[PDB]
Design a protein around this ligand. Structure first.
Ligand code: ATP
Ligand code: ATP
Ligand code: ATP
Ligand code: ATP
Ligand code: ATP
Ligand code: ATP
Ligand code: FUM
Ligand code: FUM
Ligand code: FUM
Ligand code: TTN
Ligand code: TTN
Ligand code: TTN
Ligand code: MN
Ligand code: MN
Ligand code: MN
Lengths: 551, 551, 551
């Protein structure tokens, strides 16, 4: 397409970076100021304006707005300092954006499929402009981070996730599709909000819901292909597992909250063990919460131990869980589903009432917070872990920051710098009164899904086994340098997320081929070069037509 | 167009206001959130966000950005409260925007024609998307308000002017074209600004400049028609008059700074006379400045006096001017051009050194500030006017606020509430120590160009005579209510600018037809209905294809 | 897209078959006559006009012109009577159209890549409008049928071949790409023809030619996929083999003149054996010609004999060849390439001078004409075959008709109805003076490539082995009914080519999966249903957008 439309499409718009020749040949002459700018000048304009802003939400509106104006510049900007912008485009600010989605709305992003569209989903999928989608991130908005049911306001999550697909792993933006499934919401506040972007009805929990998701999976793969990567994000607990189980063998799909989180957590644990070097037999892990993340992390931890000697049965016995009804013990009054059974032990001597009791009675060496319900890791809980363990492992992975089990300051201070801490949301360095400085790592699935998605896409993988995430876990931790470990970091610096994601992708691609799970042919000889050659770049491409003379 | 393109184009995009049937039939289903909104809900979202914002520049960036996303919504929002938004979209904030245009740039607006494009201007004009342009506002940015030479940064002015064409007179947005002629700039600061949007060279003042302007006039009329309305805006003093004289009889053109400002000022004078009722013989007008506005206002005042008895020669003697070199007297050292001659009189007994001296010597009954150089109407100047006159008329028309001759508070306090004040920039009501509250009117050409432009366009007028502006002036003043005069207002309240513009347009069309200057046929019986039936509205139109059953 | 463009694109244009609702919703109301037609009425209009036409070339221009106006109607028309239209859209008339291509030109079809575009082939491929190509038929025009070098005029062949892909096997038209490689021509007549559509230069036979084909293969696969089916058609003898050998293992490609013809010839021979039941040991095959078809058929015949007992060495001894320089015997003066070695035997007692002498000396039971040089199977050659064999097998495969080795009338008449005859071009039934009626079969590769291509495409096959063509040969012959053999038919009736192609495809698809040559996952349970469900149909599809109310 030529003319104004080239400027209206954020995918092709270069702003004043369009060269003189491009302008004349594409009919843009006169529609742009005379000045020919470079991407560097455009980036500078951005940083100057960003520096003058105050609130994170304001910055989020500004930068995400660039994605709808100049895609290339949008990614160039993220690439310039991914670390300082992560908190704005991702957790915790993204949580704030979703809560306010209907208030800040300007332009829609992604595909919206509602229960009222049942029987016509394919027609909706055919309306999406892009023809070669390779990655889809879908949500129904029932479990947005630890914020709860946000309905269609949850679309901000898939959009954010996909920006990271590109920013971190170089996956082509035009081949990503954010999707929001709208079947209603139980959030009473939103049902009375005049700005709400979804259907004004309670969540439809009948078979019609399952039917809609089925129709969706089918319509997506019918248009784009059976190996289209489909990432399930922020679905309620019940639906998450059953959809994963029902589809992981029929489509190329995975759940970021169960599997991606499982892998980053494991990566962090493997790094801690590298410092503590505790006898595999003396491992005792207590989970605060027993849902998507807990069960995901537990299963991956068991796989790591089994491949290290222990049997599945003896590894599962070293893992305990404590949910909103209390410790998961056999015969407890509160439900116990099939996924939890393997981690449901026989009631101890005395049944703990609070999590603090659980810590003093079970005496775990590791504590992992994934309840998404706030400061459950109280000062007493942390003090107990420091008195029981010389180097207690404390993970507070719930997002956003307000839902975190505890802060980095609390963890380091209350344990006198002896803990190995990690959190889902960002926290700056902590300096103790004695002068020691601790730099906490972020155990967030952003370190995993980008690299894994790229490998799966590049290898034309049909299904994703759980052993893939185990490998990604190992690839992530294998990049941690001893110097970073010394600082208190259990994960590679966020500043190097680009490189780290590519290395994870390279390792996973090698794994996929070696295990006959890759169908891209021919098999590349040098997997590293294969991956690096296919990463999308934020540098502008020439849009000039191929002119040359005939000899 | 159908599909995503309908949403990428601000002219057609309705956001969530696209109806269910429109989405399904136009291929938008799924590309928008499930919610169907009304323009009312969208307007509420805007006002909510606007209230949380602090600076006027931030509000400018936000509202102008809306014009690039949803055109209909943009004008609806202006229409909701034009009085509160005028200061942000127009003077004084627009002046601030221009000075920083390159720093806040996101998307271009309007056509840019540079000297480097001489000989190819027609191909640039053909690149503009719209096919039926009826109104053009062009500037070379040499005299932006009272800010001086801002080069291409001056494009903010034509853009702002055209917003008012639509907001005030309902002139179709798609038939408006803002233009910026870039031939360099003498502003040293901009020539070293890495964000400058124009050519990095000094202003070209050779015949090539005249050639370029001529090429533009020809290219514009060749594509859109000889009766295309061309409004010259913010050109330097020398070029402004010569281009008006050269083209006014060749094309349908006028200069807002000479003629538009002349009509608004005259409107104010006719209102003041309604309260002062001074004998035409004792009218003594003293101008601070003798350029575009002064000459424009003087000539229009003379036309008013002549049509009221006095002869052209005796009306001109009642007008004195004081420029940067001093009082304009025969044989002075400073130049006196042909336009100034009629108002250059024989040196008085003592030649004033300052403007205050000129007031005491000439004892003018009216003082009009149009020098664009700051607070020249000093406290001493104002006191003098109050000592000489019982009801002194004081006009500080220069823009923006910082370049105004004096504030409303100074005028009213220093004359103990006896002056009839008017300014180019907005000033809130003034409350004297004694309790009296005065509400000053804004003598800005925004009260004139929208209505005049609409009438000229609707009547297919070929050329615009000065008498058209005299009639617009009378039309404006004839709308002032006695109650408004009482408050101290010399102009209808800005909040009613829409109705005021339409009434001016109806009067002007009646004038155009009665004087055989209108060529639109057939001549309408009821001019009022003719104009109101053709005004563009900000209400969403149906985009549904015409579907109906056949017999 | 909507509006006039839907009517200008033959892929979407339905003419008066657009329903009333489609017209109103797609903006076509008023652009078509009021009448709403059905495809049946349109087909009728065609047959009524075709009946009035006289020459075959005129009929070719008319129907092939329909392909560029209404694609759906074009295929419906072919499907109505494939047998009567085959001689017009295919051999022999397609040969006439090519030789007159530049004289009857109206619209281009296909992609043209010239040697002058070397280094820019990819940019040419990117210009093709369709984004999901699965089948490409390419030629360089050096060996068009038996007509010789026709340069770019040869594009009519790939266009014809692809029409049959759709008419016979239901391959989607929009996924087919006709390609003509232009590197010059040695045809002196065309080099002086002002209407010639190619480069006016002799054929480039340097490495640059090979480089261009390489660039083309890489570019096509880079954009459409490594498994894109590339069918080489009508390349000269030298290049045909070496391109086959060079690419068959790197891309999904095959040569129709070497392998396609080989398979249909074999099918006919297997059918003849069904009625003659000759002892495998007494088989003696003599070839008139020793090129693409001869070596192709010979290699397949040998594979058939080897899988039926005989050794490769013993089977090759039963095959003799006679080219333009005479019988192929060891140590002859004329060259003998690597492909001919296996069939070049020790000179017999006396070296035959003519083909007739070769028949009397070798006493072959089968005679196969593939020299593309005219009536070389003279009456004397035919009588000799009838005197040496009770049931002589005579195949005159060269096309078009004028180039055939002999006619059906001559074969049946001169052998007193004792021969089993087949030809590449159509011949009507022959009635002998005694009253017996013989219906000759067409041994043309059109019976093979459509079905094979469909199976290869549906199975996502990467490379095509020779054994695939053997299986196609068997699948074709296995459809011959005893009643048809009785009439003299060695091939299923041409009228049933659609069902015959589908059946061959089903057989080949089963063959590819059983042998691990199919990569389409998952493997279908019922191959028959799998193939039939994916065949393109000529019935109009509804173009209405999905409209439905929200509950
Ligand atoms: N940067 C990327 N982002 C998203 N998908 C990619 C990216 N790079 C390559 N792919 C996909 O990875 C798969 C294997 O890559 P490969 O380079 O082999 O592609 P291809 O099939 O040759 O190219 P094409 O996709 O253009 O047909 C392809 O399906 C391709 O679409
Ligand atoms: N107040 C609480 N105290 C202890 N456990 C809680 C508490 N509140 C909720 N939980 C538990 O936390 C778990 C949440 O699981 P769910 O599947 O909803 O989310 P998740 O993805 O596991 O959590 P996260 O947001 O940390 O990733 C549940 O098992 C629930 O019982
Ligand atoms: N709201 C408007 N804004 C700008 N121009 C307008 C507007 N309304 C009408 N016009 C112009 O005013 C002139 C006279 O109006 P009138 O209604 O007679 O137009 P017309 O010639 O019948 O319509 P058209 O412009 O579609 O040919 C026309 O040239 C028209 O383009
Ligand atoms: N410091 C000054 N004191 C008195 N007069 C001044 C002074 N500075 C400039 N002037 C006069 O003001 C006039 C400006 O004329 P110009 O045509 O440039 O602008 P304008 O459009 O008339 O002004 P405005 O910005 O008020 O509309 C000149 O005649 C100039 O001599
Ligand atoms: N009628 C047809 N003509 C040409 N190619 C076809 C045709 N029908 C199916 N194909 C191709 O055969 C292959 C296997 O068919 P299948 O039905 O599995 O396709 P798919 O991959 O599910 O669909 P899609 O091509 O839309 O992604 C695909 O590459 C498809 O493009
Ligand atoms: N006059 C002739 N007598 C005998 N053989 C001939 C005669 N003329 C040409 N030939 C042979 O016919 C063969 C043609 O081979 P080529 O590869 O050019 O075409 P082909 O595809 O095999 O033929 P066809 O057009 O029948 O499919 C050559 O080996 C050539 O020697
Ligand atoms: O600098 C630019 O061209 C774009 C800026 C933006 O989109 O904010
Ligand atoms: O409310 C809307 O739909 C648009 C908002 C914007 O353009 O900012
Ligand atoms: O449209 C035609 O009949 C011919 C066109 C041409 O000769 O180019
Ligand atoms: O962002 C995350 O880390 C994860 O997706 C979550 O919901 O907690
Ligand atoms: O807006 C105005 O008042 C006028 O256009 C000026 O330049 O001062
Ligand atoms: O059509 C055919 O039979 C074959 O393709 C040939 O070139 O002779
Ligand atoms: Mn999540
Ligand atoms: Mn101005
Ligand atoms: Mn051929």
């Amino acid at each position: 397409e030529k003319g104004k439309p080239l400027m209206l499409n954020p995918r092709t718009n270069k702003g004043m970076a369009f060269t003189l020749q491009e302008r004349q040949m594409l009919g843009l002459q006169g529609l742009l100021p005379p000045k020919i700018e470079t991407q560097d000048i455009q980036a500078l304009r951005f940083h100057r304006n960003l520096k003058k802003m105050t609130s994170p939400l304001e910055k989020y509106i500004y930068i995400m707005g660039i994605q709808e104006r100049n895609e290339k510049l949008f990614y160039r900007i993220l690439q310039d300092d991914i670390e300082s912008l992560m908190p704005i485009v991702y957790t915790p600010t993204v949580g704030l954006a979703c809560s306010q989605y209907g208030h800040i709305f300007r332009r829609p992003k992604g595909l919206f499929i509602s229960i009222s569209d049942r029987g016509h989903v394919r027609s909706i999928v055919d309306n999406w402009p892009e023809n070669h989608v390779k990655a889809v991130v879908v949500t129904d908005g029932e479990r947005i981070l630890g914020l709860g049911d946000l309905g269609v306001y949850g679309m901000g999550i898939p959009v954010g996730k996909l920006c990271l697909y590109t920013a971190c792993a170089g996956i082509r933006p035009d081949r990503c599709l954010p999707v929001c499934i709208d079947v209603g919401t139980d959030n009473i506040a939103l049902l009375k909000d005049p700005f709400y972007m979804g259907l004004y009805q309670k969540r439809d929990r009948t078979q019609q819901y399952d039917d809609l998701i089925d129709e969706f999976m089918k319509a997506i793969t019918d248009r784009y292909g059976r190996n289209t990567l489909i990432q399930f994000e922020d679905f309620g607990n019940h639906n998450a597992f059953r959809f994963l189980r029902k589809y992981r063998e029929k489509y190329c799909t995975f759940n970021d909250d169960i599997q991606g989180t499982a892998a980053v957590a494991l990566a962090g644990l493997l790094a801690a063990q590298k410092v503590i070097s505790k006898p595999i037999s003396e491992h005792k892990i207590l989970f605060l919460g027993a849902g998507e993340a807990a069960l995901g992390i537990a299963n991956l931890i068991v796989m790591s131990m089994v491949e290290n000697g222990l049997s599945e049965q003896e590894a599962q016995k070293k893992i305990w869980m404590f949910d909103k009804y209390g410790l998961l013990v056999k015969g407890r009054k509160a439900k116990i589903d099939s996924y939890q059974e393997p981690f449901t032990h026989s009631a101890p001597e005395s049944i703990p009432d609070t999590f603090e009791d659980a810590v003093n009675i079970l005496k775990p060496s590791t504590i992992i917070g994934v309840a998404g319900a706030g400061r459950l890791f109280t000062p007493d809980v942390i003090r107990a872990m420091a008195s029981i363990n010389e180097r207690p492992v404390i993970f507070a992975l719930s997002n956003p920051t307000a839902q975190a089990e505890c802060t980095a300051e609390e963890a380091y201070t209350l344990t006198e710098g002896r803990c190995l801490f990690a959190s889902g949301s960002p926290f700056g360095p902590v300096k103790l009164t004695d002068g020691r400085v601790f730099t906490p790592g972020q155990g967030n699935n952003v370190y995993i899904f980008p690299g894994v998605a790229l490998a799966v896409i590049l290898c034309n993988t049909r299904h994703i086994s759980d052993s893939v995430f185990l490998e990604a876990a190992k690839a992530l931790t294998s990049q941690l340098t001893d110097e970073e470990l010394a600082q208190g970091r259990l994960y590679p610096p966020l500043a190097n997320i680009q490189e780290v994601s590519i290395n994870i992708a390279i390792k996973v691609t090698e794994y996929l081929y070696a295990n006959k799970m890759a169908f891209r042919y021919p098999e590349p000889e040098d997997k590293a070069k294969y991956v690096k050659e296919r990463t999308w770049r934020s540098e502008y491409d020439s849009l000039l037509p191929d002119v040359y003379e005939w000899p």
